[PDB]
Fold this protein.
Amino acid sequence: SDRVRSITLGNSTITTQESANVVVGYGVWPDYLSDEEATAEDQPTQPDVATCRFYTLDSVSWMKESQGWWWKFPDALRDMGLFGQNMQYHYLGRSGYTIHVQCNASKFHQGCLLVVCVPEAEMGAANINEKINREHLSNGEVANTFSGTKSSNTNDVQQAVFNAGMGVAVGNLTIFPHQWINLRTNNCATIVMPYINSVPMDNMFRHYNFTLMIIPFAKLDYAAGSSTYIPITVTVAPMCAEYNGLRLAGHQ
Amino acid sequence: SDRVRSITLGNSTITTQESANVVVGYGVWPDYLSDEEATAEDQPTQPDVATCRFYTLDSVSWMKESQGWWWKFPDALRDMGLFGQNMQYHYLGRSGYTIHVQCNASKFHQGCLLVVCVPEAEMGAANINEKINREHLSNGEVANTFSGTKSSNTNDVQQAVFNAGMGVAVGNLTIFPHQWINLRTNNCATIVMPYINSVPMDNMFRHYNFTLMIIPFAKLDYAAGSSTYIPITVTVAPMCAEYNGLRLAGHQ
Amino acid sequence: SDRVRSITLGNSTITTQESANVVVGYGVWPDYLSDEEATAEDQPTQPDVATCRFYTLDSVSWMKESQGWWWKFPDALRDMGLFGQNMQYHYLGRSGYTIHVQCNASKFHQGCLLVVCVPEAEMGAANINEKINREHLSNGEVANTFSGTKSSNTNDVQQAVFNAGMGVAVGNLTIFPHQWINLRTNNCATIVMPYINSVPMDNMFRHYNFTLMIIPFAKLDYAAGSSTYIPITVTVAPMCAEYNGLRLAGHQ
Amino acid sequence: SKDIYTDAGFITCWYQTSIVVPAEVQNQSVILCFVSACNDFSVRLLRDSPFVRQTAFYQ
Amino acid sequence: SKDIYTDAGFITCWYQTSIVVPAEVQNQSVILCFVSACNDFSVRLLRDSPFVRQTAFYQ
């Protein structure tokens, strides 16, 4: 069967038995920066498998009236072992990513999830002409949560699901690399993002590269007696990461 | 997997994912009448895909104590688009048929159906030496229903399931082209009947060619909380139909 | 699919549709005794398919707090047709065995069984320095049952599951040819034991060759409304049996 | 027909283990039995069937 | 846009039979509908979209 997939990176391995098709990127596979498109002059640090491995983020709980969660991924991996340590000592860095989102239920359950990677998802503010705090955009490994109604918390992101924070129709987010976790048949949420930017290397802290969003379009629904606690676990790997411009320890 | 089948006719397409084996005919596939077995002299009307396409009949509801339903198929397709219109303007006509019967449930359900095409199923009357009205034999696209006990409605068909209207043992009806819809594993009720008669062309109204019967041998049975409304949908196509002897509009 | 297996012996046939892999022996297949390792001088009786066929033993009921059952197999087949009759007329005999253990449930059930064939499973007594009656070791086709606590019946076997009667750790019994019947996915309990002894032929009554044990490690557990009666059926075949030293009828 | 010289045997079916169902699934189910003949089956002496019975002409 | 000369038809979906579920399974479920274009789709006359609206300059 093609429902089974093993993914091996570093000293970490993910096995899935209800994959559908491992979704992977814009057609492009991640690779190291060539020296014909390069800008910086000193020797890069291709560190090892010590960064190119899976890291598990926190789990979010999918209830009957949950709306959606999001992450910012160069910033979410900022305390995840030696990867984050390289972020704190180098000025420029660069990596693709293997995102694998897991979630499981039983056959008596129903509900459908959308898992999108959105490049440059510049969020809009809840009150219009007002600053946004960094803790409301990216909270590290901890997810920020959309709402159903419009939000009006001060110095916060406008969080409605039907506008996705950015101000578009949420059914139009299937233009980005995505999958669905239909609980009837899926768990295979890969998106192997390449490096996507407008410059050959970039700073990990000053720039957010993309945004993972997990939005349930068909909400979770079950009969009385089934397991009511259904977690969603997000695991993320850097691929072909390299670092440049070593100096003192950075901005925590 | 061989559980999946697509059937394409005209501008209509049926997809099934729990087929078992598409059942098809006496071994013979339908074909147009050759000119070495032909009788009528003027040019036939092989109309188009405008008749060779699927038509959906009415749905019958399968309850716990339902007994069986039947149709008469040159007569059941008498208001089904241009097919029926050709029936009203020609004297002689001829076609095979692709019958596809659909029915679905869940895995907590149980029950088994028999789907038979019976050529020349001449029904017997409820009171013995008395005429039968045409509305009790064929009611168009609307099914007539068998009973459990013997029936005594006036000018009506003797409708017991254990004699099938004709006067035989109902377990002997597997001599005709058939299938079973076991709700454990099926939906694949094709019977691709060829043209079967004792004359090379025949009248659509004055003669009934065959009779579809759907008889549950293992009755529908479920626990409390499952879906109690289970419909059964019958879809039927003419194949290689042709028409002959055009005159004024016929007998409605 | 490789989940399906047919096993044909004599005039008997077992079909399984949820096999996993038919487990079979120490790598060795049973075969008749060669004449270069033989000891007895007269012509052996390779009787026919009349012994090499399946026999069904009694069924044991698997409850929520059941502990384990055992058999002694040259002695358990002592009234099973002509096989047992040959045991009563010959002094020396020899056979391999095809053991097939069956057990089934639904998908809402859970529980896991261990099926081991243990050669020379010499049981220990409940009170220490005291004889054991033969009816407590082998009760024919009727299973003896382990317990949870230590036992102190007189002239009886020490029956704790966590010592398996013999005095070892019960998680170490996977060194012998075995399977698991996980009710999630199995029924395929073959063990095709060869002839294993330290002599080329042996007496069927005076010696027990091996011991079948069915021990639930993950106990049977279901929700209210499922079928509470779950039987376990053990079917056993002799293979390449032969007999030697014919005399009067033996020891019942 | 029945004579004692050509007795043919018996056909029995046995609960071997059990029927095992989960919760909220109906326990009582139904087996259907079929019969047919193989490719070595043969019949020999034409007689009239003992099931046809007529008293007067059908008119 | 809408004119009567280039009407294009109707899209309907029909309960054909039913939704059949076992016990302790939720009856009410949800269909999601997608739309896209084929490999013979083409657009022709550049105009401005009727959805952009501006009253004053954004500052």
